[PDB]
Design an enzyme around this catalytic site. Sequence first.
Site, PDB file in Angstrom:
ATOM      1  N   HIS A 161      46.958  90.428   9.807  1.00 28.17           N
ATOM      2  CA  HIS A 161      45.523  91.156   9.381  1.00 28.17           C
ATOM      3  C   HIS A 161      45.118  91.541   8.382  1.00 28.17           C
ATOM      4  O   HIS A 161      44.289  91.480   7.333  1.00 28.17           O
ATOM      5  CB  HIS A 161      45.938  92.567  10.181  1.00 28.17           C
ATOM      6  CG  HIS A 161      46.691  93.633   9.577  1.00 28.17           C
ATOM      7  ND1 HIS A 161      47.681  94.222   9.974  1.00 28.17           N
ATOM      8  CD2 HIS A 161      46.503  95.042   8.140  1.00 28.17           C
ATOM      9  CE1 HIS A 161      48.192  95.120   9.641  1.00 28.17           C
ATOM     10  NE2 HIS A 161      46.814  95.505   8.085  1.00 28.17           N
ATOM     11  N   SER A 176      49.536  98.173   3.639  1.00 32.47           N
ATOM     12  CA  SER A 176      49.677  96.894   4.901  1.00 32.47           C
ATOM     13  C   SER A 176      50.427  95.816   3.880  1.00 32.47           C
ATOM     14  O   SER A 176      50.066  95.709   3.373  1.00 32.47           O
ATOM     15  CB  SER A 176      48.368  96.579   5.591  1.00 32.47           C
ATOM     16  OG  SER A 176      48.271  96.395   6.916  1.00 32.47           O
ATOM     17  N   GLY A 177      50.998  94.980   4.892  1.00 32.26           N
ATOM     18  CA  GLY A 177      51.878  94.068   4.716  1.00 32.26           C
ATOM     19  C   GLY A 177      52.680  94.540   3.688  1.00 32.26           C
ATOM     20  O   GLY A 177      53.774  93.204   3.557  1.00 32.26           O
ATOM     21  N   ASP A 226      51.450  91.343  14.127  1.00 34.16           N
ATOM     22  CA  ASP A 226      51.406  91.058  12.994  1.00 34.16           C
ATOM     23  C   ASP A 226      52.502  90.790  11.577  1.00 34.16           C
ATOM     24  O   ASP A 226      53.096  91.622  11.140  1.00 34.16           O
ATOM     25  CB  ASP A 226      51.003  92.300  13.390  1.00 34.16           C
ATOM     26  CG  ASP A 226      49.762  92.719  11.740  1.00 34.16           C
ATOM     27  OD1 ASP A 226      49.788  91.380  11.250  1.00 34.16           O
ATOM     28  OD2 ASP A 226      49.829  94.230  11.133  1.00 34.16           O
ATOM     29  N   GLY A 263      45.592 100.285   2.480  1.00 32.67           N
ATOM     30  CA  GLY A 263      46.716  99.618   0.527  1.00 32.67           C
ATOM     31  C   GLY A 263      47.390  99.112   1.436  1.00 32.67           C
ATOM     32  O   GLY A 263      48.375  98.479   0.285  1.00 32.67           O
TER      33      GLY A 263
END
Lengths: 29, 223
Positions: free
Chosen positions: B40, B177-178, B84, B175
């Site tokens: 995402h 994420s990932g 994801d 913030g």
Amino acid sequence: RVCPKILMECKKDSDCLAECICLEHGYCG
Amino acid sequence: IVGGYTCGANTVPYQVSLNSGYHFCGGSLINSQWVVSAAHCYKSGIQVRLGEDNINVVEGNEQFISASKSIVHPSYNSNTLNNDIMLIKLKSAASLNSRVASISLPTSCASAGTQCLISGWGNTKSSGTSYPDVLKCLKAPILSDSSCKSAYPGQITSNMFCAGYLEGGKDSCQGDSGGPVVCSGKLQGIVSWGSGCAQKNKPGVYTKVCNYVSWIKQTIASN
Ligand SMILES: [Ca+2]
């Protein structure tokens, strides 16, 4: 709610991804 | 990161910032040319910033490299966030050194109760916004599949796990994420989603990286 943790600016709830909503200071959460 | 502490400059050397004019997601360096992050977080024109601590000040150890290719997992579902995960190839190879280093991929999945390190430049408030200048860290346990499934009825797939605190108060947040969830020195999770941040009974949900290690290795060696 399913809300991804990406930092994203918004002016309205519909600007955010999935079930994130637009908070008062202009970011999705 | 809500309820965390300050990691210390360059103590998490595999952490990267994905930047499109501003920081919007984290990622982890898995070798000199490849970063893994959440699907995402895909955007055209990503700049990967390595060796960062204070994301607003130039401190001297940063390497800024554009992304040349982003490969979203074939089965990513943007509605359920299942699978994801995305790999980003850097335009040129990063210079590995003491401040910029890769993280190892797991040979096995981690068990419930294992303590992991989660890091990022995301929101530090569960209500309100306070986005930090420097990298924050959180130690949090992997929760059992039952707790995870119980907290998010029908939303957890086999490619996800929960980590955090059912009491709330400490979690990853927007913030983050990932970014990485590291357990025993291996990358076990990617920050993906949750119902808000640090809410009672709503722990963060993470992509289960051990289900993807052969896909990651195949993809890196072939692109
Ligand atoms: Ca900096």
